[PDB]
């Protein structure tokens, strides 16, 4: 069993600024003699690191080399500029009659460097849907490198499937782009839903991003519409009431039409919102029932769409 | 010779944690790397991430950030996983392996990990002798059969005559039914040996220490020779 | 995270015939690739790695080739034994990834299966449910029928269907088919039948017992 080099990783990513593990290790600790890293191979290599003589201030070892027993000789170096990037080797050395020569050298750890993409944007339709339509977003997210990404589209806490991805270009590049198509269909409990686009990339470790679009600003809920009658228990005294039912967005014109004329009465009426996020307008008001049949009409203009009305007869 | 002997079946709890263990022989323990991997039943491969022992220097697979933590204890050439937060997601084989060569490559692998994450209790099963009636003369060879019923979890064992009988031996995949397991199990042999030679299925199921050997008889006739209408 | 697509993702085969898995990484990831070879119940077993060198005592039939995006593993002559599922590994990158896999199967002759049905033991019947077994052993090609009878009519309910992976040694596959209902139900029927249908035969297998017999 004669001592080997081992380097697990042939290449090796990291992204500006942040720090670059090497790993090396030993499977004999026999013969005696230090071990090294150089970056380049052949006479012209550069010395990365050192056990005993030179200063090395960005490196940094992972276990403790002082100890007889360590055969792990992986090191950090922090602070990674493009100029850091190259094939590391790592190599053990073995006493001489003067000097030391060289042993064995692992296989070398290339590092490249990568780049994070950017934080997704998701762009929603320009104009409001009623529900039972399918409309689509897009996400994009550039300036990424490696090409290789991961885009996952939820609808709240449900991943969506119908959606089409392009990663761009397939040549080489300093940087790539993501650019996705999803079809989401409004249902009419989608006030307070959310869209989101998730990207996953190897820079970033763990930790995905994402983008979100509410559909609040993509849904038209239109307007449920009745009028009632209701006989003050005590009294000669109607209870004229109109019921507009879960609409979206809260932007409302209710007009009062009296055998088709405008009224311009005074009316008791309240808004409330409802679970689903949508809302509600009530409207109500008495008459003093005179002597002399009238036809009443509850119209509603409803985000700037065509008037909705109900009849009642008196 | 290069042995690495992972720990028994798991089941646990949803939420709940678990450390699978892997024993490691036949070589110096602290000089190679050793590697998780994972296999979700009938599904891909998985690298988890990798120990080096001696060091204790770890790299995971960011997949498995916060799930899966990797340790060794060099003394007792062992290397251990342990798994955190246990969703349906982790119910899967993990398996260890042994780097070799200079990039540690997955070369000397353990025998796998069931770890079944689940809420249902441990369920030892029933077992049943199968054997026929009629066509017990007729041929030349005769089929018996052993039914392992209601267990949990996985897996079970299945051996014939404490495994000197394998043969003609076919144990059926279990099915899942309500948070139970079944399988049958069929040996062949022929029919001048049995029921002149003794013929049993031992079962055991792990999880709950539980062996059964069934020794498979012929079937009572009393009651039929006596109403021959 | 490099993704390796591996084709095919299924694939049949006689003995002796010569077979090539492909593998396609996303990036070039130079020669550091391995294959590897499961068979069921087993581990993964490293066959090739550095994509074309032969790991400790693997078969001459065994290669591996290819570099930068492209790779191929080939059998020269197939075995029976060589039955399994196969995946490439790019060891390149962390975090290292596997291809999909190959399943391989074995083409072979027709086989027709072994059928045998299997009566409710009095251990079961005690309990209070009961359980008939019929076992369809040793057939070739897979596919296969099971009808049960019960009195001559049919039955879907209650019935469940295990399949073994095909044999190592002669290439055959084996069904067990198990119809399970309570003991009264048992008690109230007397005739039942498992029906094989085979590409063997025109006609049909028939297995059946009366809950009064020895
Ligand atoms: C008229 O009826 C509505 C509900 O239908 C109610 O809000 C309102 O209070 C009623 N008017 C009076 C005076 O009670
Ligand atoms: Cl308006
Ligand atoms: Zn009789």
Same mark, same amino acid.
């Given at each position: 069993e004669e001592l080997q080099m081992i380097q697990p990783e042939k290449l090796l990513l990291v992204t500006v600024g942040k720090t670059a593990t090497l790993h090396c290790t030993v499977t004999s600790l026999l013969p005696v003699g230090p071990v090294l890293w150089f970056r380049g191979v052949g006479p012209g290599r550069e010395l990365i690191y050192n056990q005993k003589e030179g200063h090395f201030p960005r490196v940094t070892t992972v276990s403790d080399l002082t100890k007889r027993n360590n055969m792990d000789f992986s090191i950090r170096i922090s602070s990674i500029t493009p100029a850091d990037v190259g094939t590391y080797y790592c190599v053990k050395?073995?006493?001489?009659?003067?000097?030391?020569?060289?042993?064995?050298?692992?296989?070398?750890?290339?590092?490249?460097?990568?780049?994070?993409?950017?934080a997704p944007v998701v762009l929603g339709p320009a104009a409001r849907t009623t529900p039972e339509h399918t409309v689509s977003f897009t996400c994009e997210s550039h300036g990424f490198s490696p090409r290789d990404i991961t885009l996952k589209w939820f609808k709240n806490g449900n991943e969506l499937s119908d959606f089409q991805t392009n990663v761009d270009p397939t040549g080489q590049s300093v940087a790539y782009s993501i650019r996705s198509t999803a079809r989401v269909v409004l249902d009419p409990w989608d006030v307070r839903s959310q869209v989101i686009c998730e990207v996953a990339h190897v820079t970033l470790q763990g930790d995905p991003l994402r983008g979100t679009?509410?559909?609040?600003?993509?849904?038209?809920?239109?307007?449920?519409?009745?009028?009632?009658?209701?006989?003050?228990?005590?009294?000669?005294?109607?209870?004229v009431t109109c019921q507009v039912r879960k609409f979206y967005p809260q932007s409302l014109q209710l007009t009062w039409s009296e055998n088709g004329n405008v009224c311009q009465r005074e009316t008791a009426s309240t808004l409330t919102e409802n679970k689903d996020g949508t809302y509600n307008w009530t409207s109500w008001f008495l008459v003093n029932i005179s002597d002399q049949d009238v036809v009443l009409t509850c119209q509603v203009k409803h985000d700037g769409q065509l008037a909705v009305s109900k009849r009642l007869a008196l | 010779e290069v042995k690495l002997q992972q720990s028994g079946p798991e089941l646990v709890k949803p939420g709940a944690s678990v450390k699978i263990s892997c024993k490691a022989s036949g070589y110096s323990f602290t000089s190679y790397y050793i590697h998780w991997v994972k296999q979700r039943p009938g599904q891909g491969l998985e690298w988890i991430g990798w120990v080096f022992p001696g060091s204790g220097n770890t790299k995971y697979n960011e997949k498995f950030k916060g799930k899966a933590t990797l340790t060794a204890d060099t003394s007792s050439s062992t290397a251990y996983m342990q798994?955190?937060?246990?969703?349906?997601?982790?119910?899967?084989?993990?398996?260890? #392996?042994?780097?070799?060569?200079?990039?540690?490559?997955? #070369?000397?692998?353990?025998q796998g990990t069931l770890v079944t994450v689940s809420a249902a209790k441990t369920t030892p099963p029933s077992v049943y002798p199968l054997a026929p009636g009629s066509a017990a003369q007729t041929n030349s060879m005769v089929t018996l059969g052993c039914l392992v019923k209601g267990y949990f979890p996985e897996p079970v064992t299945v051996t014939w005559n404490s495994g000197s009988l394998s043969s003609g031996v076919h144990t059926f995949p279990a099915v899942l039914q309500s948070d139970l397991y079944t399988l049958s199990s069929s040996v062949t042999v022929p029919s001048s040996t049995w029921p002149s030679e003794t013929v049993t299925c031992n079962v055991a199921h792990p999880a709950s220490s539980t062996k059964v050997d069934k020794k498979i008889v012929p079937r009572d006739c009393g009651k039929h020779h006596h109403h021959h209408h | 995270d490099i993704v390796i697509t591996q084709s095919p993702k299924f694939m049949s085969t006689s003995v002796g015939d010569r077979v090539s898995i492909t593998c396609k990484a996303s990036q070039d990831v130079s020669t550091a690739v391995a294959w590897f070879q499961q068979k069921p119940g087993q581990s993964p077993k490293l066959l090739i790695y550095s994509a074309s060198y032969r790991y400790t005592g693997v078969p001459d039939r065994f290669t591996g080739s290819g570099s930068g995006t492209d790779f191929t593993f080939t059998i020269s002559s197939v075995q029976a034994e060589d039955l399994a599922?196969?995946?490439?590994?790019?060891?390149?990158?962390?975090?290292?990834?596997?291809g999909g896999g190959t399943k391989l199967e074995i083409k072979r002759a027709d086989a027709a299966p072994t059928v045998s049905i299997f009566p409710?033991?009095?251990?079961?019947?005690?309990?209070?449910?009961?359980?008939?077994?019929?076992?369809?052993?040793?057939?070739?090609?897979?596919?296969?029928?099971?009808?049960?009878?019960?009195?001559?009519?049919?039955?879907?309910?209650?019935?469940?269907?295990?399949?073994?992976?095909?044999?190592?040694?002669d290439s055959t596959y084996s069904m067990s088919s198990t119809?399970?209902?309570?003991?009264?139900?048992?008690?109230?029927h007397n005739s039942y039948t498992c029906e094989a249908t085979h590409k063997t035969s025109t006609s049909?297998?028939?297995?059946?017992?009366?809950?009064?017999?020895?």
């Open positions: 050395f073995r006493k001489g009659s003067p000097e030391n020569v060289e042993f064995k050298s692992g296989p070398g750890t290339e590092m490249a460097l990568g780049a994070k993409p950017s679009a509410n559909l609040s600003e993509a849904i038209r809920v239109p307007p449920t519409l009745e009028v009632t009658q209701q006989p003050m228990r005590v009294g000669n005294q109607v209870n | 798994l955190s937060s246990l969703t349906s997601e982790d119910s899967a084989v993990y398996f260890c #392996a042994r780097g070799n060569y200079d990039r540690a490559w997955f #070369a000397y692998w353990g | 599922v196969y995946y490439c590994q790019q060891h390149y990158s962390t975090p290292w990834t596997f409710p033991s009095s251990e079961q019947l005690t309990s209070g449910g009961a359980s008939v077994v019929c076992f369809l052993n040793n057939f070739y090609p897979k596919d296969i029928n099971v009808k049960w009878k019960i009195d001559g009519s049919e039955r879907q309910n209650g019935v469940l269907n295990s399949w073994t992976d095909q044999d190592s040694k119809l399970t209902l309570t003991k009264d139900e048992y008690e109230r049909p297998i028939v297995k059946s017992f009366n809950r009064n017999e020895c």
